[PDB]
C-alpha cells in the first residue's frame, strides 16, 4: 500500500486518501450552519469558549468577501482563513475586469477551482476545512457548501463540524415545514436554536454565539453582522427552546 | 533546478557524502609534495595494468595552473579537470584586477572554497579529489606546499602525500624528513620523493613521474631515463 | 591615442606606437606603451575610444594566456587575429561597443613567417605587408607603396619605419611625441629603446 | 512631454553655537507666481536630537525626510536603540540621495 | 530518506542537532572577557607532525575591534568570516562608525537557519566572536548553527567544552585582569588538550580598546607558558 | 512499489495510476448515454440527489462549453469542473486565433492530449473523469466524441458510460444491427430524447421521473439543456405510447 | 513531496564509487565490441553491429561508427540514442572552434569538452548518466595521428591501440599480443579484423555483420582522408585477409 | 508515525504532526505571561541562561512605538516574525498615516504561519508569541500560536509550566482587569502570576524581564536594575 | 507547487538496464500488430484498426498518419502517446527544416528528430518514456525509397521489411520467405495483407484494416496546378474500397 502517504495519489480504489484524512480534520471543528432564506442567507458559528480569560465578541470567525459575501467554515481555523484571502483576490479582480460585483455562483467556482488545484500535486496539502458561504446578487439569494476534494452544491440548508448530523436534521424538519419560504428575521432565530442544538455534540466547554446574515430587504443586499439586540432576541428564542 | 541536498549531516555529526569522497581519493592513485631549501617537488604513482598506453597524448598527472604554480590530485580524474579549468580562470583573474600572479596561499584558498560550496549546496556531490598544490609566490624564494580535501579545509605541508598506500609513504616521509634541514639541493629533494614512492609503486619504469618547481617559474618535467638513474641509484645503495 | 604602424617585412614584424597620451589642452603623459603581448611571439597595438583601449587589450590578453596555460602550446598568429575579430564583431552589435583599433604582429613558429594583421573596431580583418590605423594611414601607405620591397632586413625595415616617423612629425598636426618600436622575429618579442 | 520636476522655493538656513545649533526656514509653498500654502512647514525633528529641511522640490523633500526619519527607527531596531549621531546621520543621507544619483531628488539638504 | 528543515518529536530541528555532534568533535577554543579586555585562545591539533602548524588559522580577524575563533567544520567558516567582515566594512560605510559587536553577531546568525530545499545544510562550526564597542563594552559571544547567540563572561567550546566550562565557572570573576586571563586560558586548553601544550600547537589572541584586536605571535606565548608552568608549581 | 504511486511503468508496461483513475469514474454511480439523430445529437445522463438539503438546480454533470459543443462527465464534481473550465478556455482561445467555433472532435483531441500529458509526466495527476463532447459540426454534422484518463479518445455511432455502460452499450448495437444505419432516422429532437430515454430505461430496468434525469442537446448552432418541465413533457410522450 | 521518488544518480556510494556510473559500464560491456587501432600512416576504425536481421537495410545505416569533421571520427558502444546526443554536441564544438580561430579543432580539445559533458551528469543535476563510451579517431598538425576513448565517467585517456564494449577483456590481451610500433595501416586493419573474428559471440564473422572505417594521409600529399567502408568494400577486405 | 515526514502529509485522524512538533518547542521555552486592563497591557518574561556564565536570552521585542510581543520557542523564528511585524507596522505608517491595529497583526501573523504548513519543502514556525499593544480601541493581548491560531485574551500564559500562571489570571481576571490609571499595580498583578509558574528558582534582578504600553505610554522594556523594584 | 520533479524517472539497475525502456518495450509487445516493407519503385505499411467498442467509429481513429507528403507513419503500442509523437513530429518538420530550406526533410533526418524527442524522455527530469515502436515509411529524391523503426530508447534502424508488436516474431519470419530485392510495389502491398491476415483474429476487411503507401507522386491529390516542380504527395492512405479490391484476388 502506501497510497496514503501522498497526496494527488489514486488508490486502487480511485480514491484520494489525503483529501479523505483532511475530512477528518474538518469532523473534528466547531459547528457552523447556512440557511437560505426568502431574499437571502443567514450564517452561524459555535464558538468554544476555552477558557473565562478569553474576551468576548472579540475573536470574530465569520468573514466577509466583497460587500455581499459571506463565509464561515469549520476545521482548520488558518486554512479558511487563507481561502478567503483569496476568495477576496477572485472577487476584487472580478469587479476591477467586469464591474459588476461577482455573482455567487461565480464566486463559488473560483474557490472550488483553486481547492481542487490542492488536490492534483504531492507538493501541496488539501485544504482542511469545509466552507459554507454564500450571499445575494442579481440573480437572488444563493447558499454553497465547498468540501476539501473541490466539491460543492448549492444548498437549502447547510451544516458542518463536529455537530453536523444534529443540525443536517434540524435543517431537514425547516424545509419540509416552510415549502413557500422561510423570512430573513426567522432564519436567524432558527440558525440560534440550530448552534444550541447541535452544542449538545461539544458540550464540556460552554460556548459563544456568532450570527451573520445578507437579505435583499434587512440587510439591503450588503452582509452585516447580527448583533445587540437582533442577537440577544435570538439567544432568548434558543434559550426558550432547548428547556 | 535539481535542488536535493545530497550532501547532510547524520546523527553522528558526519556528513557521510564528503567522507565517501574522501574514500574516492583513498582509491586514486598516489601523490606526493616534498618541499626542499630550494625548491619542491611532486611526485606521482601511475598504475601498470594499463599497457598499451599512448603517454604522449595520455592527460599528465600534474597540472600547470600558472607558470609559477603546478597542481598535481588523487582520486576522480574527470572530477580533477574541473578544478584545474576553475583555478587556471581565476589564476587570469587575479593578474588582470591585481596587476600580480597569485600567491601558492590564494589559489589554494581558491581552489578549497570551491570544493567548499560543493559540500553545501543543493543539486552536487562533493568532489572525490585532494589536491597537492606546490610553487613560488611573486619575487619569493620561500618554497610553498599546500593540501586540500573534499571538505574544503587545507593546510601547508613541510612534505605530505596522499592517496592509495598514502599512510605508508607518510610513515616513511615522517622519520626521514628533518624540518630543521630540508633537503639542500634538488637531487636530494628529488630522491627523498622517489625513495618515497619505492616504498608503494611497484617498479620504477614507467609507473613514476616527477616534477620540479624551481623560483621565478622554472618548472620542469622528468623523462624516463632521468627518474631511472634515481631508481637504479637507491636501489644498489639498498642492498647493504 | 593616435598613431599605430605596422611593417612585416622578410624575418620579422616591426610596430611603432605613438607614445602620446592627451585629454583636453593638457599632454598627460609622453611615454605611454600603447602595446599588449598576447603570447611569446604575438604582439598587439591598439589605438581608439580612452579607456576601452586598455580594458579591450587586457581583456584579449587575459584570454590568450589562458589558452596557452590549458594546451601548453602558443596559438598562431593567425588563430589570435580570427579569435580578436569574433570579438570585435560581436562588440560592434553590443549595448555599447569597444571603439578600438588594432594591430596583430606576430611571429608563426611552424611556417616560419612574419604575419601582421589589420583589424578595426567593427572586426574588419586583413592581413598586410604594411598597416596603420587613424590619420597616420593618408601619409605612411603611399609612403611604403614606393618604398617598401618584401624582401627587406629587419634593419631596412627600421629605416623604412623612420622616413615614416619623420613625415608624420612633419606633417600631422598634433605632437605624438614620438614612438615606442618593438620587433617581433623568431626569438620572440624585443623592444628598440634608442628611436 | 511629461517634465517630472517642481520648484517649491522657500529657502533654509542653519547656524551651528558653542553647545548649540538652529535650523531654520520660511513657511511659504509656491508653484510659479502662485502662493500654494502661507504655512507648510519645511523642517523637521527627525528624533536623536537631529533636525532636518530638504528644499528646492517639496516632493523629493519630503519623500528624503520620510526617508530618513524612517532609517533612524530601523538604526534603533537593528542596534540596540543606539543613538545616532550626526556624523553617521550625514553619511545615510548621502547614501539615500546618491542612490538616486542618476534620477536625482531635487533639493538642497540641512541637517 | 526525509526533509532537510524537518521538526523531531521534542520539537528540534533534526540537522541542526545533528551539527552540533560536529561541533563536539571539533578542536577546543575558549574565549574570557574582563575589564582590561577579552582573550581568544585555541587548539590548533594538527593531524600529522609533517603540518607546518602556524599555516593553522583557527583564530581570526573580522574588523580592528572585532575577533573570532571557531570549532568543528573549520571550512564552512570562511563563507561566515566574508560575511562578518563585509557586514563590518559595509556598517562603516554606511553610517561613519564602528559596528556593535551584538549586531555583528546578529548579522552572522541569519546566515544559520538560511538552509534547506539558500545553502543545502547548517553551518558545521561554531563561532566565538570576541569585541569591543563603546556602548556595551568588552563582550564575547558563542554563535552556534542554530540562528542562536549567548553572550558570555567566559565560554568554551570544542571537544573539551563539559570540561572546561566547569572549570571556568570556578575560575572567573568580575575583576579579572587580562595577564591573569590569558594564563587562565593557557591553563584550561592545557588540561583538556591531548597532546601537551606549546606554543606551536595552541595559539592565543586578544582585543583591547586601545590595540585592538591582536594575534599573539609564537614567542609570546612561549613565555606565557612558561609563566604558567612557574606559577603553579610555586604552590 | 512506487511504480503504482506516480505514472511510469511498471514490469508489465502498465500505469497503475491511469488505470485507478479510471476507476474513479463511476464513484458518482452515475450512468450517460449519448445518441445520435439526422439533425442533433442527444445526451442523457440520470441525476440523483440523496440529501435533502441540497439545492437540485446545481446538481448538474452536464457542461455548456461553447454555444455550439456540449459536454457530459462521468466522475467526481470537482475534476469535471477543472475539466470543464479548461474546455470552456480552450474553446473561446481556438475562436480567436483562428476565426471559426472550435469543432467537437478538435476539441476532443485537445483535452486528449492534456490527459495524455498527465499519464507522461510525474507532478501532474491524471483526472478521474470521462468527457463525452456532442455537437451538430458544421462540417461533419451529428458528433459525439469521448475521452478518458488515459489520453484515448474516438468518435461514436453511439455511446454510454457508467456503472452499467456495458449493458446501455449492447441494447444500443442491438438496434443499429436492426435499423441498419448510423443514427436515429428521426426528423425533431424532442423524438430523439424520447428515444434516449426509452432505451436507457429498457437497459437499466428502472423507470424515471422529471428529477431523476438530465438532459442536453445540440442542435445546429446552439446547445442547450432540458429542464424538469421539458423532460416531464417528454416522459409523458413515452408513457401515452 | 517528490524526495519519495528521487534515485539520487549523483552520489557516492560507502565504498567511494558512482553507482550509476558503474552500471553505465555494466551496460556498455554487453553492445557490440569496437576496436580502434593506430598506425605510423594511419587509424582504424572496426565495429561489431548488435546482432544482426537479414531483413536490415546494410548499406544505407549507421550504428556504431559517426564522423564528427573531416580530420576526427568516433566509434560507439552502448545507446545510440545517447551517443547521437552527444555527436551532434561534438559536431557542433568543433565548428564553434572552427569559426573563433579559423583552424580545425586539435582532437583532444574536442575529446576533452565532451568528456567534460559526461562528467557534469555524474556530479550535478540529478539526472542519469550517458549510457555512452567512445573511441576517437583523429589527425591534427600537432600530435598527429591521435586515439582516445571516454566513458560515462567522464574520465578519458589515450590509446596506440583499444577496444570498448563487449569481450574488451579478451579483445585487449590479443591486442597486447600481435600490436607493434612500426606497424602499417594494411596490416592494423588486418589485426582489427582477426581479433574482431576471435571475440565474436557469432559463429562466423560477415561483412553484414560490420562497419569499417580507416584514416590515412593516403589522399594526395600532406592532408588526411576519411573513409567510412561500403558492404561490398567490407566483403573484399574480409577475403583479402582470408578470414571469409 | 508515517505521517510526520513533512507539513504537507495528513495523518489518518487529520493531524499535522510537523505542526504539532512545532507546538512542542513552545512547551520546552521559558515561560512568559501577558495580561491587560482597559488603559495598559502588560508582558512578563522570565529570561533563561545557558549557565551562570552566559547572559540571560531576551524574551520581548519591540514592534513599534505602540505594538511589541514576548517569544516562547525558537528565538530565531521569533526574529524572523517580529521583523515581518515591524514591516506591516511600518508600512501602515508610511502609506496611511495610521497606527497598525493589533487585531490586523495578528491576522497577518496567522496568514504567515500558515503557508508554512501547506507547502512542500518549507516548515512551520517554531515559536509561541504574546503581542501586546495600545491602538484607536484601547488596550490589547494576543496569543500567537505557530499552527496559526491567534486569538485575543484579557490575559494568557505560555512556555514551560505556564498552566500555573494561566490559572491565576483566570482567578484574578475581575481584578486586574480594573487597574486602570496605574502601571506599577498592574505589573505587579503579572509578577504575581508568572510567580505561579516557578519551580526552585526565583524572580532575580538580571532574571526578570518586563514590558508595558498605554493610553500614555510608548512599548518600552524593563531590564537590570529597573526591575529591581517588583521583587 | 511547481514541478519539482527535476530528476531521473528511467536510471540504471545494478544489471546494466534500463527499467523504463525495458518495461515500455514490454507495453509494445502488447500493442497491436502493426508492419513495413518496402518494394523497388514504393513502401507499404499497415496494421490492423482494434475498434474499442462496434458503436466508436473506427474511421475517426487514425492509426497511420501523414507527417510530411512523402512520409508516413504507423505504430504498435499505446495510441496516445503515438498521437502526441505525430503532434511534435509534424510540427519538428517544419521547425528545425522547411523553415530553414523552403523544402521538407528527408526519411532519415525527420526519424532522427523523432528518435531524439523519445530519447529525451529516457533521461529527462520527471517524465517516462513514450510507450510506443514507430515504423516510419518516406522518399526522398537523393535517398530514394526508405522504411525505419524507432524504439522507445529512441533508436532507429533501417529496414527492408519488418513487423513490431503483438505477432510480430511469426510476421518477422513470414516476410523473410516471401521478401526479395526485385519486389513491385503492388507485389509488397499483396505480402502486407497477406503477412496481416495471420495476426489479426476477428474481420479481416477494408473497415477493420488501415494501409498506406508511399509510391509515385499523386497530381489529383495535390489541389493546385501551374507549378511543373510541385507534382504531389506520394504517401497516399489506401481507401476501404482499394483493400477490398485486393482481397479478391488474394
Ligand atoms: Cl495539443
Ligand atoms: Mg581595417
Same mark, same amino acid.
Given at each position: 500500500?502506501?497510497?496514503?502517504? !501522498? ?24 459547528? !457552523?450552519?447556512? @440557511? ?12 468554544? @469558549? ?79 476545512? !469545509?466552507? @459554507? ?61 440550530? @448552534? ?20 435583499? !430587504? ?26 | ?240 | ?195 | ?111 | ?13 533534526? +540537522? ?193 580598546? +586601545? ?25 | ?241 | ?244 | ?26 512547551? %520546552? ?57 515591524? %514591516? ?29 504548513? %501547506? ?43 505556564? %498552566? ?23 505589573? $505587579? ?39 529591581? $523594584?517588583?521583587? | ?16 538496464? /534500463? ?19 518496402? *518494394? ?44 502526441? /509523437? ?6 519538428? *518538420? ?42 516510419? *515509411? ?37 516476410? =523473410? ?6 519486389? =513491385? ?17 476477428? =474481420? ?33 492512405? /489506401?481507401?476501404?474500397? =482499394? ?6 484476388? /488474394?
Amino acid at each position: 500500500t502506501g497510497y496514503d502517504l !501522498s497526496n494527488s495519489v489514486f488508490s486502487p480504489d480511485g480514491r484520494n486518501f489525503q483529501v479523505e484524512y483532511a475530512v477528518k480534520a474538518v469532523e473534528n471543528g466547531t459547528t !457552523s450552519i447556512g @440557511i437560505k432564506c426568502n431574499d437571502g442567507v443567514v450564517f452561524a458559528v459555535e464558538k468554544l @469558549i476555552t477558557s473565562k480569560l478569553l474576551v468576548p465578541q472579540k475573536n470574530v470567525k465569520i468573514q466577509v468577501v466583497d460587500r455581499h459575501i459571506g463565509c464561515v467554515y469549520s476545521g482548520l481555523i488558518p486554512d479558511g482563513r487563507h481561502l478567503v484571502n483569496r476568495g477576496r483576490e477572485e472577487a476584487a479582480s472580478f469587479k476591477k475586469l467586469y464591474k459588476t460585483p461577482i455573482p455567487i455562483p461565480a464566486f463559488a467556482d473560483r474557490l472550488g477551482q483553486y481547492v481542487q488545484a490542492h488536490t492534483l500535486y504531492n507538493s501541496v496539502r488539501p485544504f482542511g476545512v !469545509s466552507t @459554507i458561504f454564500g450571499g445575494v446578487d442579481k440573480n437572488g439569494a444563493h447558499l454553497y457548501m465547498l468540501e476539501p476534494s473541490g466539491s460543492y452544491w448549492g444548498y437549502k440548508g447547510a451544516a458542518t463540524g463536529k455537530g453536523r448530523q444534529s443540525a443536517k436534521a434540524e435543517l431537514e424538519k425547516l424545509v419540509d415545514h416552510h415549502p413557500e419560504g422561510l423570512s430573513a428575521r426567522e432564519a436567524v432565530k432558527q440558525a440560534a436554536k440550530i @448552534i444550541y442544538l447541535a452544542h449538545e455534540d461539544n458540550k464540556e466547554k460552554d460556548f459563544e454565539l456568532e450570527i451573520s446574515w445578507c437579505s435583499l !430587504s434587512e440587510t439591503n443586499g450588503l452582509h452585516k453582522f447580527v448583533k445587540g439586540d437582533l442577537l440577544q432576541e435570538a439567544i432568548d428564542f434558543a434559550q426558550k427552546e432547548i428547556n | 533546478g535539481y535542488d536535493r541536498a545530497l550532501s547532510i549531516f547524520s546523527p553522528d555529526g558526519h556528513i557521510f557524502q564528503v567522507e565517501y569522497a574522501l574514500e574516492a581519493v583513498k582509491r586514486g592513485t598516489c601523490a606526493v609534495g616534498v618541499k626542499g631549501k630550494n625548491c619542491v617537488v611532486l611526485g606521482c604513482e601511475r598504475r601498470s595494468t594499463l599497457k598499451l598506453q599512448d603517454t604522449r597524448i595520455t592527460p599528465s598527472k600534474v597540472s600547470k595552473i600558472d607558470s609559477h604554480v603546478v597542481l598535481s590530485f588523487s582520486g576522480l580524474n574527470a572530477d580533477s579537470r574541473i578544478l584545474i579549468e576553475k583555478a587556471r580562470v581565476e589564476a587570469q583573474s587575479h593578474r588582470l584586477t591585481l596587476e600580480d600572479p597569485v600567491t601558492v596561499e590564494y589559489l589554494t584558498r581558491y581552489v578549497a572554497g570551491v570544493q567548499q560550496r560543493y559540500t553545501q549546496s543543493g543539486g552536487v556531490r562533493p568532489f572525490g579529489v585532494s589536491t597537492l598544490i606546490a610553487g613560488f609566490d611573486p619575487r619569493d624564494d620561500e618554497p610553498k606546499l599546500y593540501q586540500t580535501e573534499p571538505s574544503g579545509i587545507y593546510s601547508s605541508w613541510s612534505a605530505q602525500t596522499i592517496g592509495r598506500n598514502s599512510k605508508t609513504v607518510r610513515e616513511f616521509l615522517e622519520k626521514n624528513y628533518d624540518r630543521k634541514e630540508p633537503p639542500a639541493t634538488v637531487e636530494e629533494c628529488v630522491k627523498l620523493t622517489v625513495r618515497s614512492l619505492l616504498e608503494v609503486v611497484q617498479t620504477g619504469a614507467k609507473n613514476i613521474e616527477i616534477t620540479v618547481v624551481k623560483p621565478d617559474s622554472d618548472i620542469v618535467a622528468l623523462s624516463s631515463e632521468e627518474i631511472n638513474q634515481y631508481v637504479t641509484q637507491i636501489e644498489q645503495e639498498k642492498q647493504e | 591615442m593616435d598613431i599605430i604602424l605596422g611593417i612585416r617585412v622578410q624575418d620579422s614584424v616591426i610596430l611603432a606606437s605613438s607614445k602620446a597620451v592627451t585629454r583636453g589642452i593638457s599632454v598627460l603623459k609622453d611615454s605611454d606603451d600603447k602595446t599588449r603581448q598576447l603570447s611569446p611571439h604575438t604582439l598587439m597595438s591598439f589605438a581608439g575610444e580612452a579607456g576601452d583601449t586598455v580594458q579591450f587589450a587586457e581583456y584579449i590578453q587575459a584570454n590568450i594566456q589562458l589558452y596557452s596555460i590549458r594546451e601548453d602550446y602558443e596559438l598562431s598568429p593567425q588563430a589570435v587575429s580570427s579569435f580578436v575579430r569574433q570579438e570585435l564583431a560581436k562588440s560592434i552589435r553590443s549595448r555599447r561597443p569597444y571603439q578600438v583599433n588594432v594591430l596583430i604582429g606576430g611571429y608563426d613558429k611552424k611556417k616560419n613567417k612574419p604575419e601582421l594583421y589589420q583589424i578595426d573596431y567593427l572586426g574588419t580583418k586583413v592581413e598586410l605587408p604594411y598597416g596603420a590605423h587613424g590619420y597616420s594611414g593618408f601619409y605612411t601607405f603611399s609612403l611604403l607603396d614606393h618604398h617598401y620591397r618584401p624582401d627587406m632586413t629587419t634593419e631596412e625595415g627600421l629605416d623604412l619605419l623612420k622616413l615614416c616617423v619623420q613625415e608624420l612629425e612633419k606633417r600631422m598636426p598634433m605632437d605624438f611625441k614620438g614612438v615606442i618600436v618593438k620587433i617581433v622575429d623568431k626569438d620572440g618579442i624585443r623592444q628598440v629603446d634608442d628611436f | 512631454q511629461f517634465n517630472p520636476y517642481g520648484d517649491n522655493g522657500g529657502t533654509i538656513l542653519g547656524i551651528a553655537g558653542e553647545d548649540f545649533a538652529v535650523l531654520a526656514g520660511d513657511t511659504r509653498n509656491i508653484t510659479d507666481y502662485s502662493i500654494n500654502s502661507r504655512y507648510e512647514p519645511k523642517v523637521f525633528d527627525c528624533g536623536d536630537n537631529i533636525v532636518m529641511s530638504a528644499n528646492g522640490f517639496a516632493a523629493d523633500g519630503d519623500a528624503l525626510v520620510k526617508r530618513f526619519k524612517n532609517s533612524v527607527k530601523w538604526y534603533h531596531f537593528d542596534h540596540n536603540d543606539k543613538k545616532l549621531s550626526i556624523n553617521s546621520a550625514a553619511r545615510n543621507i548621502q547614501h539615500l540621495l546618491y542612490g538616486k544619483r542618476f534620477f536625482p531628488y531635487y533639493v538642497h539638504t540641512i541637517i | 530518506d526525509r526533509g532537510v528543515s524537518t521538526f523531531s518529536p521534542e520539537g528540534r530541528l533534526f +540537522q541542526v542537532e545533528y551539527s552540533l555532534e560536529a561541533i563536539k568533535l571539533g578542536s577546543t577554543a575558549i574565549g574570557i572577557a574582563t575589564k582590561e579586555g577579552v582573550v581568544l585562545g585555541v587548539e590548533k591539533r594538527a593531524t600529522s607532525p609533517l603540518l607546518e602548524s602556524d599555516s593553522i588559522e583557527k583564530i581570526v580577524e573580522i574588523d580592528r575591534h572585532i575577533g573570532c575563533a571557531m570549532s568543528g567544520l573549520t571550512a564552512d567558516a570562511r563563507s561566515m568570516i566574508e560575511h562578518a567582515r563585509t557586514a563590518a566594512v559595509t556598517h562603516n560605510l554606511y553610517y561613519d562608525e564602528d559596528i556593535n559587536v551584538e549586531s555583528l553577531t546578529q548579522s552572522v546568525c541569519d546566515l544559520a537557519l538560511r538552509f534547506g530545499e539558500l545553502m543545502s545544510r547548517p553551518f558545521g562550526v561554531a563561532l566565538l566572536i570576541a569585541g569591543h564597542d563603546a556602548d556595551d563594552g568588552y563582550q564575547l559571544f558563542h554563535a552556534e548553527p542554530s540562528g542562536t547567540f549567548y553572550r558570555y563572561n567566559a565560554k568554551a567550546i570544542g571537544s573539551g567544552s563539559e570540561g572546561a566550562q566547569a572549570e571556568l565557572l570556578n575560575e572567573w570573576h568580575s575583576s579579572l585582569t587580562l595577564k591573569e586571563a590569558e594564563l587562565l586560558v593557557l591553563k584550561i586548553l592545557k588540561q583538556v588538550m591531548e597532546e601537551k601544550l606549546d606554543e606551536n600547537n595552541a595559539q592565543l589572541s586578544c582585543i583591547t580598546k +586601545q590595540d585592538g584586536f591582536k594575534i599573539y605571535d609564537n614567542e609570546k606565548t612561549a613565555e606565557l607558558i612558561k609563566e604558567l608552568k612557574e606559577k603553579e608549581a610555586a604552590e | 512499489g512506487y511504480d503504482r504511486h506516480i505514472t511510469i511503468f511498471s514490469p508489465e508496461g502498465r500505469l497503475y495510476q491511469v488505470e485507478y483513475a479510471f476507476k474513479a469514474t463511476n464513484q458518482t454511480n452515475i450512468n450517460s448515454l449519448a445518441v445520435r439523430g439526422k439533425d442533433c445529437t442527444v445526451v442523457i445522463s440520470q441525476k440523483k440527489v440523496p440529501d435533502k438539503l441540497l439545492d437540485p438546480t446545481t446538481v448538474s454533470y452536464i457542461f455548456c462549453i461553447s454555444r455550439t459543443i456540449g459536454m457530459v462527465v462521468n466522475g467526481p464534481i470537482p475534476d469535471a469542473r477543472n475539466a470543464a473550465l479548461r474546455a470552456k478556455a480552450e474553446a473561446a482561445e481556438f475562436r480567436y486565433k483562428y476565426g471559426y467555433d472550435m469543432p467537437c472532435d478538435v476539441l476532443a483531441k485537445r483535452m486528449a492530449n492534456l490527459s495524455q500529458i498527465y499519464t507522461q509526466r510525474a507532478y501532474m495527476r491524471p483526472l478521474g473523469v470521462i468527457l463525452t463532447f456532442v455537437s451538430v459540426d458544421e462540417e461533419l454534422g451529428p458528433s459525439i466524441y469521448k475521452t478518458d484518463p488515459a489520453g484515448y479518445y474516438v468518435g461514436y455511432k453511439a455511446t454510454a458510460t457508467g456503472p452499467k455502460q456495458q449493458e446501455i452499450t449492447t441494447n444500443l448495437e442491438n438496434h443499429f444491427k436492426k435499423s441498419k444505419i448510423d443514427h436515429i432516422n428521426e426528423e425533431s429532437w424532442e423524438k430523439v430524447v424520447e428515444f434516449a430515454i426509452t432505451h436507457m430505461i429498457d437497459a437499466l430496468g428502472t423507470e424515471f421521473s422529471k428529477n431523476d434525469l438530465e438532459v442536453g442537446v445540440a442542435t445546429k448552432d446552439k446547445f442547450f439543456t432540458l429542464s424538469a418541465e421539458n423532460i416531464e413533457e417528454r416522459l409523458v410522450a413515452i408513457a401515452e405510447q | 513531496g517528490s524526495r519519495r521518488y528521487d534515485s539520487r544518480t549523483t552520489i557516492f556510494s560507502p565504498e567511494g564509487r558512482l553507482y550509476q556510473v558503474e552500471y553505465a559500464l555494466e551496460s556498455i560491456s554487453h553492445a557490440g565490441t569496437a576496436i580502434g587501432i593506430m598506425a605510423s600512416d594511419g587509424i582504424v576504425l572496426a565495429a561489431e553491429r548488435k546482432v544482426t536481421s537479414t531483413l536490415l537495410e546494410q548499406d544505407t545505416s549507421t550504428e556504431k561508427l559517426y564522423k564528427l569533421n573531416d580530420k576526427i571520427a568516433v566509434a560507439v558502444a552502448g545507446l545510440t540514442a545517447d551517443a547521437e546526443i552527444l555527436i551532434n554536441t561534438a559536431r557542433i564544438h568543433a565548428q564553434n572552434y572552427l569559426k573563433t580561430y579559423n583552424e580545425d579543432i586539435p582532437v583532444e580539445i574536442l575529446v576533452r569538452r565532451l568528456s567534460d559533458i559526461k562528467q557534469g551528469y555524474t556530479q550535478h543535476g540529478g539526472l542519469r548518466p550517458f549510457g555512452v563510451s567512445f573511441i576517437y579517431a583523429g589527425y591534427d598538425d600537432r600530435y598527429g595521428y591521435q586515439l582516445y576513448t571516454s566513458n560515462p565517467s567522464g574520465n578519458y585517456t589515450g590509446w596506440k591501440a583499444i577496444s570498448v564494449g563487449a569481450n574488451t577483456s579478451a579483445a585487449q590481451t590479443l591486442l597486447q599480443m600481435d600490436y607493434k610500433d612500426d606497424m602499417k595501416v594494411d596490416d592494423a586493419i588486418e589485426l582489427a579484423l582477426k581479433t574482431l573474428s576471435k571475440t565474436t559471440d557469432s559463429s562466423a564473422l560477415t561483412y553484414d555483420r560490420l562497419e569499417f572505417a580507416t584514416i590515412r594521409k593516403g589522399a594526395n600529399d600532406g592532408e588526411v582522408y576519411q573513409k567510412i567502408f561500403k558492404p561490398q568494400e567490407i566483403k573484399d577486405i574480409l577475403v583479402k585477409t582470408g578470414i571469409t | 508515525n508515517n505521517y510526520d515526514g513533512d507539513t504537507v502529509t495528513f495523518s489518518p485522524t487529520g493531524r499535522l504532526f510537523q505542526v504539532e512538533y512545532a507546538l512542542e518547542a513552545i512547551k %520546552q521555552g521559558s515561560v512568559t505571561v501577558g495580561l491587560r486592563s482597559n488603559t495598559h497591557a502588560v508582558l512578563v518574561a522570565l529570561k533563561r541562561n545557558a549557565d551562570e556564565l552566559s547572559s540571560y536570552q531576551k524574551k520581548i521585542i519591540k514592534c513599534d512605538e505602540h505594538m511589541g510581543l514576548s517569544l516562547a520557542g525558537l528565538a530565531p523564528d521569533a526574529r524572523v516574525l517580529s521583523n515581518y511585524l515591524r %514591516q506591516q507596522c511600518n508600512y501602515s505608517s508610511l502609506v496611511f498615516n495610521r497606527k497598525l491595529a493589533v487585531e490586523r497583526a495578528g491576522h497577518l501573523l496567522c496568514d504567515k504561519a500558515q503557508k508554512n504548513t %501547506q507547502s512542500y519543502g518549507g516548515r512551520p514556525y517554531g515559536v509561541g508569541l504574546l503581542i501586546i499593544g495600545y491602538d484607536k480601541s484601547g488596550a490589547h493581548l494576543l496569543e500567537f500560536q505557530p499552527s496559526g491560531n491567534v486569538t485575543e485574551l484579557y490575559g494568557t500564559a505560555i512556555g514551560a509550566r505556564s %498552566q500555573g500562571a494561566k490559572t491565576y489570571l483566570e482567578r484574578t481576571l475581575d481584578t486586574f482587569i480594573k487597574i486602570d490609571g496605574n502601571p506599577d499595580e498592574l505589573i $505587579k498583578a503579572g509578577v504575581e502570576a508568572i510567580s505561579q509558574s516557578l519551580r526552585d528558582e526565583s524572580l532575580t534582578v538580571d532574571n526578570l524581564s518586563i514590558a508595558i504600553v498605554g493610553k500614555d505610554t510608548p512599548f518600552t522594556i524593563y531590564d537590570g536594575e529597573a526591575v529591581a $523594584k517588583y521583587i | 507547487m511547481t514541478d519539482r520533479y527535476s530528476f531521473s524517472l528511467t536510471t540504471f539497475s545494478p544489471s546494466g538496464k /534500463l527499467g523504463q525502456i525495458d518495461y515500455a518495450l514490454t507495453a509494445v509487445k502488447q500493442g497491436v500488430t502493426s508492419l513495413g516493407i518496402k *518494394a523497388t519503385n514504393g513502401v507499404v505499411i499497415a496494421t490492423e484498426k482494434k475498434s474499442s467498442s462496434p458503436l466508436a467509429m473506427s474511421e475517426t481513429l487514425s492509426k497511420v498518419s501523414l507527417l510530411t507528403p512523402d512520409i508516413g507513419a504507423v505504430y504498435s503500442g499505446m495510441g496516445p502517446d503515438y498521437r502526441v /509523437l505525430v503532434d511534435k513530429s509534424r510540427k519538428v *518538420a517544419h521547425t528545425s527544416y522547411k523553415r530553414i530550406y523552403g523544402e521538407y526533410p528527408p526519411t532519415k533526418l525527420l526519424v532522427s528528430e523523432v528518435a531524439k524527442i523519445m530519447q529525451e524522455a529516457t533521461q529527462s527530469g520527471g517524465v517516462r518514456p513514450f510507450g510506443v515502436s514507430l515504423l516510419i *515509411a518516406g522518399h526522398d529524391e537523393f535517398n530514394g525509397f526508405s522504411l525505419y523503426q524507432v524504439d522507445p530508447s529512441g533508436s532507429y534502424f533501417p529496414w527492408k521489411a519488418t513487423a513490431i508488436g503483438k505477432g510480430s516474431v511469426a510476421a518477422k519470419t513470414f516476410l =523473410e520467405k516471401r521478401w526479395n530485392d526485385e519486389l =513491385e510495389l503492388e507485389d509488397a502491398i499483396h505480402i502486407a495483407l497477406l503477412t496481416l491476415k495471420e495476426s489479426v483474429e476477428g =474481420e479481416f476487411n477494408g473497415d477493420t484494416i488501415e494501409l498506406a503507401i508511399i509510391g509515385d507522386e499523386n497530381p489529383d491529390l495535390l489541389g493546385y496546378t501551374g507549378i511543373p516542380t510541385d507534382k504531389g504527395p506520394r504517401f497516399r492512405k /489506401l481507401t476501404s474500397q =482499394e483493400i477490398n479490391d485486393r482481397l479478391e484476388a /488474394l
